[model samples]
Target: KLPPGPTPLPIIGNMLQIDVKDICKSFTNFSKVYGPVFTVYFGMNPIVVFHGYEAVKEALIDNGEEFSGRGNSPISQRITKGLGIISSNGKRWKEIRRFSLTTLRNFGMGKRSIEDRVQEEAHCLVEELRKTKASPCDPTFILGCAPCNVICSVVFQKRFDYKDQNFLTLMKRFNENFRILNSPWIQVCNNFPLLIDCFPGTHNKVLKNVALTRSYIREKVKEHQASLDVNNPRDFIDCFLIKMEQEKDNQKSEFNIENLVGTVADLFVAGTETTSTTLRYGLLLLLKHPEVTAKVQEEIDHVIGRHRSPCMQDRSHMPYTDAVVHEIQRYSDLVPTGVPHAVTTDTKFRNYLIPKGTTIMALLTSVLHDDKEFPNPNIFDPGHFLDKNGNFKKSDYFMPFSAGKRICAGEGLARMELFLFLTTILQNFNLKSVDDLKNLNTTAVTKGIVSLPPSYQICFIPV
Candidate 1:
């Protein structure tokens, strides 16, 4: 039998007792009554939710294979159609995920390392910010452009000019889809999958945006096809096309045009927004707490100086800046309830028998916000990541990227981008809030699949 929890009523199980908006808070409250591992239902569906570090670690880390399956979500399923890295399952999921990870790693071996690409983008972002001339501007789109270009460089082997119409449209669509995904209507759609067609909400908009985005990807793939050099792959699309050619005789191979489009779209969509949002939110936090920003600037001056761009090698020397970055991700607690997982087979987690294909919500915020590991977890203090001697302190509970075999595919790239982008911006500019410091609200504007900082303007004054 499934683990014990609050009993459910037909049609709308457990949700009546919970708030639809702040679902994370409600789940945390449930763990206070029912132990860490328990069950709750949304409509007729039963989802086993794991709370805190121990419970999440046990399932995601200890029993990684059992918990590796991607849970069904009508919203994601509609777009992905069980084909891409993030949404596919079984052999298709394994083959695509493995190929994508290996391909990403190969970028490091290439003449232009991923670090070089990120550093180049960071410099480009600095130049764009300089054009602001200390005038207040909303960084939403510009910040979006910087990270989006990094993905474009890696996947398409080119970066678009910030003013490029196609690039802007792609950015707008990605940003809009993420906002809608995190909206309250999405939860309702997920709970009642059938209403997806019947509903009047913007949840259906994600489907249309995805189709347009895929068409763009297909056009690029065709361009790569016409200029194919089998021995010398230029970028991600080239590598995949070459692989498709190699595996043409093997009908069972997953390297077809369909998977190629799905995977590229996955990388493009997943890689862009997360890093940009973190950078945007981190800047807001720095604006809110200038004292912290001053310390980071001091570290940058001492380690790399003002003339050269910040590189990955300098991260070890700048412990305080590293700590501040970790703190920002921890405090922001992005992806509070991470992408759902399912039990690959009927397996035992603790005392419960989780049947095959059961949906699971491994709450990442539980680990990030746990009081035992991080005292006063609600407060924004880098000291949580620093020892008394001022050295960077690592915590097992620090998991901005959820753990296990199904961990984020772009973790390495994302880390490099986050560090280079943030340090470069801080090194060149003194962040000044347009409004009074006290008026700034550093809390997340939205809390769902992603945590977004409230809209605010700032000046990037020359240091």
Candidate 2:
């Protein structure tokens, strides 16, 4: 039997019953009424929702393979076509996700070498940020640019000048895609995509924005094709092309130029925004809670010293700094609804009968904000990730990167970037809200796939 949920209306389903945009509120309210494993219809399709860490764990972790299939919103399926890592499933996903992770490791993901890449970028970043010292500056571009360049290093073996117009345009288009993805208009069309086909709205613009980014990525693919050497692979593109050539004779192989292009697009979409936005939002959190910022700076100053650079090695000794980073991620709860998961096989999740290919959504916001796990889940507390003894504490409920087989491939890289970039900033500058300290707005502005901090300026006072 299907899990209990409210009856749906003819055309709209439960779209009106639950607020479409603020998924946290809707999911929590629904779970209270219908229980955790309830079903909600988006238009005609029934989607199984998993609320709290326990349900998500029981489904995604304990019963992993049954829930291992990738799920896409109507907009994503139409846009992504189940091609790349974020959207693909079965053998194709297995091959691409494995190869990508292995290749990323060879190029220094989860290693000290990646630290150098971020540290180098941090040097350039500190320089650029220095330009804005004593003046209020919007950190969105500066923050976004660092992660963009880091991905540029990984994928194309090239990094752009911060002031390059083409690079700026690239950032703009990439960021535009993110904003549109989270847009309320797209949310409506995703439920009833036919309306989108009959009347193309803001989502059409997102499609075009995606096309432009794909076109740019394709140009890099062409460049890689022209100069790929098996003996000396430069970056991700080089590695994928060499594999394509090797796998050409195998008729069943999914390695192709199409996958190559799509994979690069996936990397750009997945890699760029999350870390940058986190860094940006983390700084905002610090601004709101200056005491926490002072504690981190104090920890950094004592451990690494002001002149010495901060490294990942220092994270172990500096519990307060690590706790602050963890708390920032927890507090922000970036992907509230999370990327959808699908049941590839007939799955029996608890008492519910989930048919093959049912979309399973784990409410990450529910877990991150779970009051039992995090006392005062809404408040910003570095102690959330710290033991009473001042040691950095770890929690399995911290699934900002999600969990199980479908975990983010770039989790290692993102963690490295967040730690290095965040610490680098604290090592150099004392940041303050651009407005009066008491008037700063810490509440997030946008509530979408990734909730974004409201637009605000901050002055980077040189420490």
Candidate 3:
């Protein structure tokens, strides 16, 4: 017997009750009525959702192995053929994930090398904003482009000029596809197999964007292959090419052109959208909470000073600012459903049997906003992350990057990006609401697999 949920009709299942625009809100409402762990059919398939800390922790951590397999959702499979680090499973997943970790480490993911890149991007972002002359403008472009260029630097061994035609086209396609994906029509395609097989709608455009991005990556791979010196690896693509050559003889080797393409796609997708969205929300939240913004500026001024740039090391000394960044992540709850996964084997959670191949989603938003964990969960309170003496205290429940196997491969890089970007931006500029800022919607608009805050513009006043 499945967990209690709203009864569904024959073919559509619970699809009628689902609101494609705000799936997270709908899921939260369902959790309240159905309890923590419940099942709902998206067409004929029974998908299980684990909400709140107890159920999410039980399924993700306690039953880690059984629930570690990536979900074989048709839409996701079409996007990434179980080849990249995000969607792959079993031995191939393990091999590729491990290799990605090693390559990222070698290229200085958590070290000073990557930090240096982030710092440079931050400076560029500040300089670009300064050129706007404090006019009321949308900071989303520079906010997104800066971190995106950092990922490009790591993967392609170079950064892009903000006006580069190809880079702009790729970013535009990513934005359009992201918007189209959240449409109810796309959700219908994802839920129904027959409809998807026969005729794909906006979902087809998303797939086309995936192919376009892959083509771009392939071109970069060829460039790296031609110039790569085995003695000295320049970037991630170079390292991956060398690994593929080394493992060419192994029949089961997961390292190849497809895997490389998919991995780069993963980096572009995960590395770009998530951090940029977070920064976008961070600016909005700062505008809404002016007192907190002032405090952050004070901290940055005291810790890093105006002339010197912000760095990862500065996070330790700026406790209030550090806590504010963490609180922003918690408050925004960016990746609400922490990537879907499937059960690899039979497992029991609170007397409920989750059979092999069962699809499970860990609702990370519920965990981040738990009332028991954070006193005023709804409010954007930096004090939630600070101790009594205002020191930055790490919470065990902070799972923005998810947990266990298959956590974000670029977690370290993302952390560095968020810190550097937020601190540097605050140091150089003060974000203020535009004339109609109060009327701006802060709620999320679902984009198929990802959820983003509604579009809003603000003034980035140079300090």
- Tens-place lDDT per residue, model 3, 1-463, is 5667889889988988887666667889999899999888888777889898888887788877788898777777878877788888888888888888887763443233767777888888888988888887877788889878888888887788888999899888877866665456656776786677655556577788888888989998999888978887767888899889999898778898999999887888778878998988888888888899999999888888988988878888989988988988898888787777888977677767777887888888888988988987888899999999989989878888887776778888888888888888888888877665567666665545566777777777877
Q: What ranking of all candidate models by lDDT puts the best one first?
A: 1, 2, 3
Candidate 2 per-residue lDDT over residues 269-288, each given as its tens digit: 99999988899999899888
Once superposed on the true structure, which residue ranges of model 3 sit more than 4 Å away at CA? 106-112, 197-204, 436-441, 445-449
Which pairs clash (backbone N, Cα, C closer than 3 Å) in model 1?
Answer: none
lDDT of each: 0.88, 0.84, 0.81
TM-score of each candidate? Answer: 0.97, 0.95, 0.94
The prediction achieving the highest TM-score against the true structure is 1
Q: Write the per-residue lDDT of candidate 1 for residues 20-67, one digit (tens) a residue.
A: 777888899999999898899888888999999999999999999999
Residue 115 in candidate 3, Cα distance off native in Å: 1.3
Residue 284 shift from truth in candidate 2, angstroms: 0.5
Model 3: how far residue 11 lies from native, Å: 1.6
Cα-lDDT of candidate 2? 0.84
lDDT preference between candidates 1 and 2, better one: 1
Off by over 4 Å in 1: 106-109, 200-204
